[PDB]
Amino acid sequence: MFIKAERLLIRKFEFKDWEAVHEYTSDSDVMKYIPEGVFTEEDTRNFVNKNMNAKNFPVILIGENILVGHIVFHKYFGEHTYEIGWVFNPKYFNKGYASEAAQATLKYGFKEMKLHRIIATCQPENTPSYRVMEKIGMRREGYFKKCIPHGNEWWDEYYYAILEEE
Amino acid sequence: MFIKAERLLIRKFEFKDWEAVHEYTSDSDVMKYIPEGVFTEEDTRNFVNKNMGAKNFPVILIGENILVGHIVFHKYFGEHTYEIGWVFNPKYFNKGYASEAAQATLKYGFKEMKLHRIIATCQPENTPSYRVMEKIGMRREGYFKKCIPHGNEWWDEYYYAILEEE
Numbered sequence: 080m081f082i083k084a085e086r087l088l089i090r091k092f093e094f095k096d097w098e099a100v101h102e103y104t105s106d107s108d109v110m111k112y113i114p115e116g117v118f119t120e121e122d123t124r125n126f127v128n129k130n131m132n133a134k135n136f137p138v139i140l141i142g143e144n145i146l147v148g149h150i151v152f153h154k155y156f157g158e159h160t161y162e163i164g165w166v167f168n169p170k171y172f173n174k175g176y177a178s179e180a181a182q183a184t185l186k187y188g189f190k191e192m193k194l195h196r197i198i199a200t201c202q203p204e205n206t207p208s209y210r211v212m213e214k215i216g217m218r219r220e221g222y223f224k225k226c227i228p229h230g231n232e233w234w235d236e237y238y239y240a241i242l243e244e245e
Numbered sequence: 246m247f248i249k250a251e252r253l254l255i256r257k258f259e260f261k262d263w264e265a266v267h268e269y270t271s272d273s274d275v276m277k278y279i280p281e282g283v284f285t286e287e288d289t290r291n292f293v294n295k296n297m298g299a300k301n302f303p304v305i306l307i308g309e310n311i312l313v314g315h316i317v318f319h320k321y322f323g324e325h326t327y328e329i330g331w332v333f334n335p336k337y338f339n340k341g342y343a344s345e346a347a348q349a350t351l352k353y354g355f356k357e358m359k360l361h362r363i364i365a366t367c368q369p370e371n372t373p374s375y376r377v378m379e380k381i382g383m384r385r386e387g388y389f390k391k392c393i394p395h396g397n398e399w400w401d402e403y404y405y406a407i408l409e410e411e
């Protein structure tokens with residue numbers, strides 16, 4: 080997959096990417112909702128290596144050629160419905176890179192891959208996540224209570240969707 | 246070669262081109278798949294001087310008058326079969342310049358030089374390179390496993406070709 084957006088591009092991982100990924104995958108605040116939790120350096124290398132059946136795609140600032148996060152994008156229901164997500168370096172929080180990248184991924188999915196539907200989920204506590212989802216045109220279709228086991232707790236989930244027709 | 250395309254021209258090197266070439270030949274991301282790896286300033290000067298006679302030809306943006314890369318074009322098998330390649334400045338990637346220049350070179354080779362065949366090679370990992378090959382009409386004819394010695398490592402190679410009839 081290769082997508083060119085306005086300030087950024089989305090491409091497949093290269094091994095050298097791991098260092099920039101580790102800047103945020105080692106961050107307990109960034110990784111708060113990821114079930115695997117924070118990554119060691121070895122974890123981040125294995126993550127990058129596994130995604131070179133790729134489901135995660137780095138987001139690169141064009142010009143500076145700096146890795147600012149990654150897009151999660153994979154089959155969800157048949158081959159017609161995919162799931163999208165993202166993890167970004169909090170350094171760039173105010174720049175709106177997530178919404179740009181996510182929107183460009185929706186465009187690719189619908190226009191180029193001819194998908195029917197794309198979904199995303201997040202915890203109700205993850206305000207920045209569902210705010211991006213809303214900004215790129217996704218609708219909240221579900222609010223599932225105590226549905227996800229996370230350690231010794233059950234977490235809730237908002238479920239968002241967007242159709243190709245939208 | 247003097248070749249005019251839509252947005253660019255290809256000509257032979259002048260010595261003062263070396264500084265613009267050095268901008269990318271000193272870049273280790275640019276020269277990752279190039280056997281030499283990164284050039285020193287003396288390496289770039291030597292390269293430009295050697296190709297003033299010529300197997301490498303700068304690509305100049307018309308109007309802006311900016312050297313954005315070079316085309317590799319030289320005899321491969323007798324005088325009837327040539328090899329083509331390309332090395333460009335990352336500031337100008339993903340605008341279609343390499344493909345535009347390489348398309349124009351093929352046309353010159355077949356129409357004006359009356360060549361029979363033109364080939365190109367690259368590593369399978371070098372996605373933009375084989376995408377140029379495909380875009381300009383070349384066919385993948387080979388996939389050679391562990392054939393290229395790079396240090397004490399062995400790389401794979403894709404082999405592409407295009408014929409006069411195509």
Ligand SMILES: CC(C)(COP(=O)(O)OP(=O)(O)OC[C@H]1O[C@@H](n2cnc3c(N)ncnc32)[C@H](O)[C@@H]1OP(=O)(O)O)[C@@H](O)C(=O)NCCC(=O)NCCS
Pocket residue numbers: 080081090091274275276278279330331332333334337338339340341342343344345366367368371372373374376377380
């Ligand atoms: C190969 C090179 C000359 C291409 O230059 P360029 O002007 O960006 O090439 P173009 O814009 O004409 O085409 C590049 C194609 O690759 C695609 N591309 C670029 N990066 C990509 C990536 N990481 N993954 C998938 N596709 C990619 C582009 O989308 C484009 O295809 P498209 O037009 O169908 O979308 C340039 O990347 C380069 O100089 N590389 C370093 C030197 C090198 O390795 N030379 C080749 C040795 S064989």
